[PDB]
Amino acid sequence: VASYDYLVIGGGSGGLASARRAAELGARAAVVESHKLGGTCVNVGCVPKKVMWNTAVHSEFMHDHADYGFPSCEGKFNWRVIKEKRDAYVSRLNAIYQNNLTKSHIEIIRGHAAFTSDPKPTIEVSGKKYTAPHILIATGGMPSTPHESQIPGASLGITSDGFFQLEELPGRSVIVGAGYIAVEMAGILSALGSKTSLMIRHDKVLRSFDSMISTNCTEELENAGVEVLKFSQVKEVKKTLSGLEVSMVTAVPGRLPVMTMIPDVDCLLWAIGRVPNTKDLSLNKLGIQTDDKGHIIVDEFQNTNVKGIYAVGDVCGKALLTPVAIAAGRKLAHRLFEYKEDSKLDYNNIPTVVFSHPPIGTVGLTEDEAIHKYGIENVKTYSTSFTPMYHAVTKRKTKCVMKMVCANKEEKVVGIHMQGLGCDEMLQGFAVAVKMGATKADFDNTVAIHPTSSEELVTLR
Amino acid sequence: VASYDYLVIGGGSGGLASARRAAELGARAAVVESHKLGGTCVNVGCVPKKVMWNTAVHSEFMHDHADYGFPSCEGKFNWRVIKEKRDAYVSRLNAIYQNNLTKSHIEIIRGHAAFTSDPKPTIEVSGKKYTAPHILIATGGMPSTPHESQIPGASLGITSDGFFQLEELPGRSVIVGAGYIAVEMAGILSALGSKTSLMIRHDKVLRSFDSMISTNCTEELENAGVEVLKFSQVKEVKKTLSGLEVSMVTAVPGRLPVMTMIPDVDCLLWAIGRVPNTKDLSLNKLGIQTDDKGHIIVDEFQNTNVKGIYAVGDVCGKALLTPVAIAAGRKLAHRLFEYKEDSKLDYNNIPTVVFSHPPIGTVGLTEDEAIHKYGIENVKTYSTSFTPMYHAVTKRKTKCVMKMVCANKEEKVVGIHMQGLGCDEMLQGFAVAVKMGATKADFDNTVAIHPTSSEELVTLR
Ligand SMILES: Cc1cc2nc3c(=O)[nH]c(=O)nc-3n(C[C@H](O)[C@H](O)[C@H](O)COP(=O)(O)OP(=O)(O)OC[C@H]3O[C@@H](n4cnc5c(N)ncnc54)[C@H](O)[C@@H]3O)c2cc1C
Ligand SMILES: Cc1cc2nc3c(=O)[nH]c(=O)nc-3n(C[C@H](O)[C@H](O)[C@H](O)COP(=O)(O)OP(=O)(O)OC[C@H]3O[C@@H](n4cnc5c(N)ncnc54)[C@H](O)[C@@H]3O)c2cc1C
Ligand SMILES: N[C@@H](CCNC(=O)[C@@H](CSSC[C@@H](NC(=O)CC(=O)O)C(=O)NCC[C@H](N)C(=O)O)NC(=O)CC(=O)O)C(=O)O
Ligand SMILES: N[C@@H](CCNC(=O)[C@@H](CSSC[C@@H](NC(=O)CC(=O)O)C(=O)NCC[C@H](N)C(=O)O)NC(=O)CC(=O)O)C(=O)O
């Protein structure tokens, strides 16, 4: 039984960040990883995603070429070119991560970990046992797929994982889901030339975003050539002579349900949710609490119900983002190895960027949420809508929408919501301001940067 | 003698903003304007500049086309196309501004104003007299040109004004100056295909920026194809059979001076400074104080030395930016018409973006300035340099450099300096944070947005 100061199960965003910081603090740590370092973000997430988005972005900017004085650019996108390059880039990161572990003196135990029956918390990986007085579960999640029992042929469609394995651009594609992944994927497939549909169960996407964003986002999708099938759901999938045929039920409220076949589908992509990867851990041998989705339950300090067993990131099922796993794994190393008992992540005011076209940035409360927290009489919002100066000379147009939610008399800024060109890079510092508790006077007393999009947030009236 | 509550001399950024706010407060105001509303920014500045930069930006992104999966884009930029469109856009703004005045009930007195000999401060425009108990001088500045007496043939070159009148793309161009305008113009001419030189009297551009920025900026210029002639200056200009021929002295220190002829120059562009437009105001009839450059002297509240005569913006010669004229003209309307005696602009922490390639964002103190204000032992800086993920798959590369200057133990952030893709839109909110007095813990406690460039500012170590 080899013993360590800290054993980390999962070599992804959270596990790596935690192990690394712990090691700086003097801990003798090991990372168990059964697949590739970097975990979801690097391999099939954030990274290969952003590369594909920058690719889609080139496709749209190239539509503006002629408007800008140049001669029309003519053609066909070549998927394999960028795919090979994207893959290589991911290979490059994997080796950097591996080296990071090494320089830190972190041991890497390769293989699939599971808890044992043993009294003191202990895992087994490939017949060997390992133990530590602090064990971190950071095994993340996976794409959820439907059961053939509820939707026959569900297994003919792919997930975001499968999207990263594609070798050619699908001629016809149908995406099911209304979350950010769904949105992002529909936007990349479309810009790249796939004839794309987004199948959503209601009337808008991103329904948990401020309603200014779900509305604006649904429109921009449509304007960009994406067909959003509202109130629709898949009833069955079948392999036809040439692709797939998707049977769907459309149930607009106040209308009779209607069934439609969607034929000649090259790509059916499920973007319906994520499930926690806890199934094969043998948790129950220690009685670790999970919820009914298989999520590990933790407290504000990332503790599980069992002493010296913690969990961070996706597995815990809250705020499914890479920087949140990182921040939580980092605060936890300080708490365990630097004895900072108050060290924990504040889950409020986490900012998100959705890589749509135009991208989306959001931090803090939606208008509704502020209304529920402070009361209608104590919530005031400010907003603006304009056409970015980039489009002053184009025929193609996009819009920029910004919304600021304030609370109480002081007009404390509790929420910033926007969509528009540049909004991916504009977010970070307002998110700092929002964390510090700024009010609207603070924003207003900041001299504007002209001409930009970002100056609109500081000149709202 | 028509009387008003507020007479504004100048219909540019500062004069318009001041007149408008004053009118909301109940004042009966008139704007005197001898040219076009919008003043320098709209007509020959910020606006036509940004349009041309977005144009240059298309030129560079089009170099990356093939790397991204697409087929090479082949060609020739057409200057007249974009120029016509740019002009129309400016026409569009002029009419909006005019309408803004109108809806506000601001009277527009068209023509050139000058003070009179009269005891109570009074101006004359086209034989008629006008007066008010509060008069705002906001007549801005103009491009400085050399005297034929010091540099013979100086008059064969043009200024930034003339740049906006050009109808074709100059085949060979030489820019003189090392300030932001100079930089911006060299970057636009170059990207658009002009064979461009930047003639600077020292070894770096933007010498008043943090030294990380002047160095990085000089390099990026070179890497982008701009020839920076260091320690050089123009000795004479002459009209040859085919263009201009520029005689220059190059005086590298520790070396003998060397004289060079630069032949076949299509465009010689002076970007050497700006002079205040006060010459034709008859100031001296009221004894209004100016400095020896013709700048109007004011105090922290924008007062001149004469009661009920104020000055804002470029004419005053400090912080030559559109949003500063605006903020000062606005604070002044509140002070005069809303009786807020403490209403004035804080000139610290004004942020700037330089529209270079990649753009530059800066707010607060340079490393040197913090060193002088707090002492070497109390200044700590943090910085990073990396290749933005956009270039992971290109052959062409640019870099991103960020620097954070902190002071005292608390590590108060007194300065942020960066250069890189996205840096034009990233600045605004950090500038809010810097205005609020944030420290580095504040930045550090903000959850990062991944994958972006902006997340680097919040993960500095
Ligand atoms: C398509 C897509 C795009 C995304 N885009 C972004 C984005 O742009 N920005 C962002 O912030 N987030 C994004 N996310 C979310 C982000 O990827 C996740 O929040 C993040 O990866 C969660 O990290 P984690 O540390 O919990 O686990 P993961 O990163 O999933 O790592 C868990 C690791 O555990 C290993 N493992 C699991 N079980 C075991 C076991 N029993 N033994 C050993 N090893 C094991 C797995 O192989 C894996 O490497 C995206 C996600 C997806 C799917
Ligand atoms: C090439 C260039 C690019 C620039 N880019 C930017 C940028 O991107 N961002 C930025 O923030 N700043 C930029 N600037 C700076 C910005 O344009 C100036 O700071 C700003 O215009 C100053 O405004 P102002 O109100 O003092 O005067 P101005 O805007 O110059 O207006 C003064 C007005 O007074 C009128 N006038 C003058 N004398 C009289 C008189 N006697 N009677 C009647 N009318 C009179 C003039 O016609 C004019 O319209 C740029 C400047 C230039 C030259
Ligand atoms: N800052 C933005 C665009 C800002 N403005 C617009 O698109 C104007 C079209 S023209 S209004 C002047 C626009 N600016 C210029 O060209 C101005 C300039 O040269 O300063 C503008 O509103 N600029 C920003 C001023 C700032 N928001 C303030 O209040 O200080 N319409 C709206 O804001 C919607 C509305 O309120 O009707 C950008 O650079 O893309
Ligand atoms: N955030 C930037 C790029 C960031 N990183 C780099 O270019 C890495 C090349 S790889 S290091 C991992 C780079 N990221 C990923 O691909 C990571 C991911 O998938 O999270 C990275 O450093 N990401 C940001 C993590 C963050 N800055 C933190 O400290 O939390 N080199 C440096 O930062 C320079 C150095 O310190 O040697 C972007 O998205 O362009």
Side-chain angles (χ1 to χ4, degrees):
Chain A
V1 191
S3 174
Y4 295 78
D5 299 328
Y6 199 36
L7 259 182
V8 177
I9 312 185
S13 293
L16 300 174
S18 207
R20 288 172 68 242
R21 178 70 39 107
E24 333 173 8
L25 292 179
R28 165 75 189 114
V31 172
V32 189
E33 169 74 37
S34 43
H35 298 263
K36 314 217 190 137
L37 307 147
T40 299
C41 179
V42 178
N43 297 295
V44 299
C46 333
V47 185
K49 182 274 287 312
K50 187 67 185 281
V51 170
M52 299 312 280
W53 185 83
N54 284 325
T55 305
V57 171
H58 237 274
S59 204
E60 308 160 23
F61 281 146
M62 147 198 73
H63 304 315
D64 311 327
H65 219 45
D67 283 330
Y68 260 105
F70 287 92
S72 225
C73 241
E74 102 193 303
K76 110 222 144 316
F77 169 59
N78 180 351
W79 186 281
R80 72 195 311 279
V81 177
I82 204 73
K83 175 212 183 211
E84 290 159 346
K85 295 185 207 203
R86 192 181 81 226
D87 282 342
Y89 178 49
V90 167
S91 287
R92 295 192 308 277
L93 300 174
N94 309 135
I96 285 183
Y97 282 105
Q98 184 160 343
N99 181 231
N100 286 160
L101 283 196
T102 90
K103 282 178 330 174
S104 278
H105 306 104
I106 294 151
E107 183 150 12
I108 301 157
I109 293 168
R110 255 102 56 168
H112 165 92
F115 286 99
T116 61
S117 17
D118 303 289
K120 75 191 202 286
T122 297
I123 68 160
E124 203 176 94
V125 185
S126 283
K128 310 237 280 182
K129 288 224 229 245
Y130 303 86
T131 183
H134 304 288
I135 293 177
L136 171 86
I137 304 170
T139 54
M142 303 149 232
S144 184
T145 55
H147 280 274
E148 220 81 10
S149 80
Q150 89 134 124
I151 285 159
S155 72
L156 293 169
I158 60 167
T159 68
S160 50
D161 283 10
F163 170 91
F164 284 117
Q165 300 216 212
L166 283 188
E167 317 225 26
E168 336 270 319
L169 174 70
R172 176 81 171 99
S173 54
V174 172
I175 295 139
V176 189
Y180 86 94
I181 294 177
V183 173
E184 309 186 323
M185 332 254 70
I188 290 156
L189 288 166
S190 197
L192 298 175
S194 189
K195 164 127 270 148
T196 309
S197 295
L198 180 65
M199 197 192 303
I200 77 173
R201 321 181 50 127
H202 298 256
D203 57 327
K204 287 153 173 169
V205 300
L206 309 177
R207 280 186 338 115
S208 81
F209 283 58
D210 184 272
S211 91
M212 172 173 81
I213 301 311
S214 58
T215 297
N216 190 73
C217 184
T218 309
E219 314 193 341
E220 290 283 29
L221 287 159
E222 283 173 314
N223 293 331
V226 176
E227 165 181 67
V228 186
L229 298 182
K230 319 180 187 174
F231 301 97
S232 320
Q233 87 202 35
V234 169
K235 188 213 148 336
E236 116 184 284
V237 191
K238 84 166 208 176
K239 188 47 233 137
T240 71
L241 269 181
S242 310
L244 309 166
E245 182 160 295
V246 186
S247 266
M248 70 155 184
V249 178
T250 296
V252 170
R255 212 141 179 202
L256 293 166
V258 41
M259 255 231 299
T260 308
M261 246 58 72
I262 309 166
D264 298 327
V265 173
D266 297 318
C267 174
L268 180 64
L269 204 167
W270 300 113
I272 61 169
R274 313 258 309 160
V275 51
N277 214 320
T278 57
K279 209 260 231 333
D280 285 279
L281 282 184
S282 292
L283 292 175
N284 55 265
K285 292 180 186 280
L286 285 168
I288 292 147
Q289 276 185 246
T290 52
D291 60 13
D292 65 4
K293 332 291 240 169
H295 298 111
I296 290 165
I297 313 295
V298 294
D299 73 11
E300 69 227 289
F301 294 106
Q302 317 295 161
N303 300 290
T304 68
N305 54 314
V306 184
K307 283 167 213 156
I309 308 203
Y310 321 84
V312 307
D314 280 21
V315 77
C316 285
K318 100 146 143 169
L320 316 183
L321 294 171
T322 271
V324 179
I326 293 163
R330 289 183 178 144
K331 294 284 194 184
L332 177 58
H334 284 283
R335 179 174 73 88
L336 304 186
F337 306 106
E338 185 169 47
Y339 311 98
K340 310 215 178 133
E341 74 148 348
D342 63 327
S343 178
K344 55 171 179 65
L345 179 60
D346 179 10
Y347 289 78
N348 303 118
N349 306 136
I350 284 157
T352 322
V353 163
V354 178
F355 284 100
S356 46
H357 304 271
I360 290 155
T362 181
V363 60
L365 305 184
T366 67
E367 183 174 9
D368 285 330
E369 291 157 337
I371 273 171
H372 172 279
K373 171 148 190 256
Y374 303 92
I376 299 264
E377 74 225 66
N378 304 298
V379 162
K380 160 116 215 220
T381 66
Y382 292 93
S383 72
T384 187
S385 185
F386 58 98
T387 300
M389 161 158 191
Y390 171 83
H391 294 295
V393 307
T394 67
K395 291 173 172 153
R396 182 180 71 104
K397 306 288 187 186
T398 61
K399 201 191 294 188
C400 179
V401 301
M402 276 173 178
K403 172 144 141 186
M404 176 193 288
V405 193
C406 302
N408 309 149
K409 138 235 337 157
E410 22 258 55
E411 296 197 316
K412 184 147 148 179
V413 184
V414 302
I416 299 186
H417 314 292
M418 44 190 198
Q419 173 169 25
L421 275 188
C423 290
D424 42 329
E425 298 290 358
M426 204 187 295
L427 198 61
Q428 190 87 65
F430 305 110
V432 177
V434 164
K435 189 74 180 243
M436 285 167 77
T439 73
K440 165 106 150 58
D442 289 309
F443 278 58
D444 293 342
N445 286 315
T446 306
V447 168
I449 299 165
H450 192 52
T452 65
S453 267
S454 75
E455 71 177 305
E456 301 307 313
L457 263 193
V458 302
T459 56
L460 289 173
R461 270 177 120 229
Chain B
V1 191
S3 174
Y4 295 78
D5 299 328
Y6 199 36
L7 259 182
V8 177
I9 312 185
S13 293
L16 300 174
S18 207
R20 288 172 68 242
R21 178 70 39 107
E24 333 173 8
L25 292 179
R28 165 75 189 114
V31 172
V32 189
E33 169 74 37
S34 43
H35 298 263
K36 314 217 190 137
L37 307 147
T40 299
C41 179
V42 178
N43 297 295
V44 299
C46 333
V47 185
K49 182 274 287 312
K50 187 67 185 281
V51 170
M52 299 312 280
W53 185 83
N54 284 325
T55 305
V57 171
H58 237 274
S59 204
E60 308 160 23
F61 281 146
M62 147 198 73
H63 304 315
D64 311 327
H65 219 45
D67 283 330
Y68 260 105
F70 287 92
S72 225
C73 241
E74 102 193 303
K76 110 222 144 316
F77 169 59
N78 180 351
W79 186 281
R80 72 195 311 279
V81 177
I82 204 73
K83 175 212 183 211
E84 290 159 346
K85 295 185 207 203
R86 192 181 81 226
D87 282 342
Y89 178 49
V90 167
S91 287
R92 295 192 308 277
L93 300 174
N94 309 135
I96 285 183
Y97 282 105
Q98 184 160 343
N99 181 231
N100 286 160
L101 283 196
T102 90
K103 282 178 330 174
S104 278
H105 306 104
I106 294 151
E107 183 150 12
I108 301 157
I109 293 168
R110 255 102 56 168
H112 165 92
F115 286 99
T116 61
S117 17
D118 303 289
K120 75 191 202 286
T122 297
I123 68 160
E124 203 176 94
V125 185
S126 283
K128 310 237 280 182
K129 288 224 229 245
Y130 303 86
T131 183
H134 304 288
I135 293 177
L136 171 86
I137 304 170
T139 54
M142 303 149 232
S144 184
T145 55
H147 280 274
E148 220 81 10
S149 80
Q150 89 134 124
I151 285 159
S155 72
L156 293 169
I158 60 167
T159 68
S160 50
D161 283 10
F163 170 91
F164 284 117
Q165 300 216 212
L166 283 188
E167 317 225 26
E168 336 270 319
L169 174 70
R172 176 81 171 99
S173 54
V174 172
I175 295 139
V176 189
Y180 86 94
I181 294 177
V183 173
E184 309 186 323
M185 332 254 70
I188 290 156
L189 288 166
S190 197
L192 298 175
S194 189
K195 164 127 270 148
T196 309
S197 295
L198 180 65
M199 197 192 303
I200 77 173
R201 321 181 50 127
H202 298 256
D203 57 327
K204 287 153 173 169
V205 300
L206 309 177
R207 280 186 338 115
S208 81
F209 283 58
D210 184 272
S211 91
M212 172 173 81
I213 301 311
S214 58
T215 297
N216 190 73
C217 184
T218 309
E219 314 193 341
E220 290 283 29
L221 287 159
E222 283 173 314
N223 293 331
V226 176
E227 165 181 67
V228 186
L229 298 182
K230 319 180 187 174
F231 301 97
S232 320
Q233 87 202 35
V234 169
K235 188 213 148 336
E236 116 184 284
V237 191
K238 84 166 208 176
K239 188 47 233 137
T240 71
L241 269 181
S242 310
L244 309 166
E245 182 160 295
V246 186
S247 266
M248 70 155 184
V249 178
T250 296
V252 170
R255 212 141 179 202
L256 293 166
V258 41
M259 255 231 299
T260 308
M261 246 58 72
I262 309 166
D264 298 327
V265 173
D266 297 318
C267 174
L268 180 64
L269 204 167
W270 300 113
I272 61 169
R274 313 258 309 160
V275 51
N277 214 320
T278 57
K279 209 260 231 333
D280 285 279
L281 282 184
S282 292
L283 292 175
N284 55 265
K285 292 180 186 280
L286 285 168
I288 292 147
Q289 276 185 246
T290 52
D291 60 13
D292 65 4
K293 332 291 240 169
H295 298 111
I296 290 165
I297 313 295
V298 294
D299 73 11
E300 69 227 289
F301 294 106
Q302 317 295 161
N303 300 290
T304 68
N305 54 314
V306 184
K307 283 167 213 156
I309 308 203
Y310 321 84
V312 307
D314 280 21
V315 77
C316 285
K318 100 146 143 169
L320 316 183
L321 294 171
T322 271
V324 179
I326 293 163
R330 289 183 178 144
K331 294 284 194 184
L332 177 58
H334 284 283
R335 179 174 73 88
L336 304 186
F337 306 106
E338 185 169 47
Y339 311 98
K340 310 215 178 133
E341 74 148 348
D342 63 327
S343 178
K344 55 171 179 65
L345 179 60
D346 179 10
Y347 289 78
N348 303 118
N349 306 136
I350 284 157
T352 322
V353 163
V354 178
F355 284 100
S356 46
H357 304 271
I360 290 155
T362 181
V363 60
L365 305 184
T366 67
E367 183 174 9
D368 285 330
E369 291 157 337
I371 273 171
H372 172 279
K373 171 148 190 256
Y374 303 92
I376 299 264
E377 74 225 66
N378 304 298
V379 162
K380 160 116 215 220
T381 66
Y382 292 93
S383 72
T384 187
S385 185
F386 58 98
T387 300
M389 161 158 191
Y390 171 83
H391 294 295
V393 307
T394 67
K395 291 173 172 153
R396 182 180 71 104
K397 306 288 187 186
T398 61
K399 201 191 294 188
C400 179
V401 301
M402 276 173 178
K403 172 144 141 186
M404 176 193 288
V405 193
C406 302
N408 309 149
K409 138 235 337 157
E410 22 258 55
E411 296 197 316
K412 184 147 148 179
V413 184
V414 302
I416 299 186
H417 314 292
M418 44 190 198
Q419 173 169 25
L421 275 188
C423 290
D424 42 329
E425 298 290 358
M426 204 187 295
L427 198 61
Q428 190 87 65
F430 305 110
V432 177
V434 164
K435 189 74 180 243
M436 285 167 77
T439 73
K440 165 106 150 58
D442 289 309
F443 278 58
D444 293 342
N445 286 315
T446 306
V447 168
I449 299 165
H450 192 52
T452 65
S453 267
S454 75
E455 71 177 305
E456 301 307 313
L457 263 193
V458 302
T459 56
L460 289 173
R461 270 177 120 229

